[PDB]
Design a protein around this nucleic acid. Sequence first.
DNA 1: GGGACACATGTTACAG
DNA 2: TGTAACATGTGTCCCC
Lengths: 199, 199
Amino acid sequence: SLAKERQKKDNHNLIERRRRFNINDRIKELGTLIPKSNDPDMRWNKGTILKASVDYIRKLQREQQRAKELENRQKKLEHACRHLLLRIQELGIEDFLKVDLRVAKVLSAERVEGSEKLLKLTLSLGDEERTVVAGIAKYYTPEELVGKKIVIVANLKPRKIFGIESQGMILAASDGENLSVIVPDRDVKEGAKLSAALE
Amino acid sequence: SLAKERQKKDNHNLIERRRRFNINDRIKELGTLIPKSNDPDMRWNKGTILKASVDYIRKLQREQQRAKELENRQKKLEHACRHLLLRIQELGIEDFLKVDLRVAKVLSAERVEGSEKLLKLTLSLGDEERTVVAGIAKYYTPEELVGKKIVIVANLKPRKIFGIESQGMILAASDGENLSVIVPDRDVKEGAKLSAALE
DNA sequence: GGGACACATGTTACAG
DNA sequence: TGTAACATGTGTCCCC
């Protein structure tokens, strides 16, 4: 029974060589996130890299109560600014036409893997077609707006989002724990230009 | 020499045994801080606690930088509204505009059990209510103060004493022989913001 | 020469 | 069973 021990040992070896390389490479990542906090006076070993990760987390847990009070405060200041701006009416109509608000008919509603926030969807502006990413996952289901037409912003530059190119942006009114999209009352031909000036 | 051979080993073994104990006891301590894994049936092996803490820090770093941006924005608002209300820009008046002195109204005052000289006030600023503690019980009765409009420092950091949170503190002046609160001369609406009188 | 490291085996749990 | 996850003890390397 010697030919088996030659392979039973070679199997156990690369089991641990995978486990060793796994943990020791995961500690290396931790070393990149911790702050230096000092000059080259202490050598970064696993003993200290871990101790630093613990000490780093506890400090971050201490700042948690401060941020909770800021998010509460911003909900109150956003409500004030929302009402304050209501009495500043100085938009030049030339500066409004710079923005091209357009009606778009939805074609795809591809959810995005590993993401409970963003939804990928292919829109159609008539002749032109675009793909836009929308952070509306937790509220709007994908197979809900397929075929129905919505209002977006067109004159934008294509920017990669979550590894996806999104040339455009979707309008949405929010109320915190719930948000809606913008939708034409009566059906119109998609790709239509929104215009405030009366003709 | 076979003793010196073992003595070199028995020491070498103990030095390493103390090293692994340290970097394993950190992973244990690192596990006490990682939150629940959304699965009440989960195996917490080291390779995952390291992976977990890495991801848990990458997430806390984003949340930290977010509040870092928010407090900057909120600080910018206070700066704008502060320079708004003071049209005649004066350099020497600075260091005092930072103080938000306002006229409040004592809705209800009650003595605090266990304190000889403390008083729990319930101030109204018109817009909102406030609970402020002041140490003037040895001089003012709770029956006197009700309805009396007092000037208070309405933007002091909330300091908790006697388990009650004093949101700002009232103004008082004492000559040593006596003590009085600071009121406005003519009757003005609650929540009126004091300012320097000059032209 | 002592502290940190990676590597090859002995032990336990009880997977898949 | 035979992995998968934790354990110990020994040899190479480092410092400059």
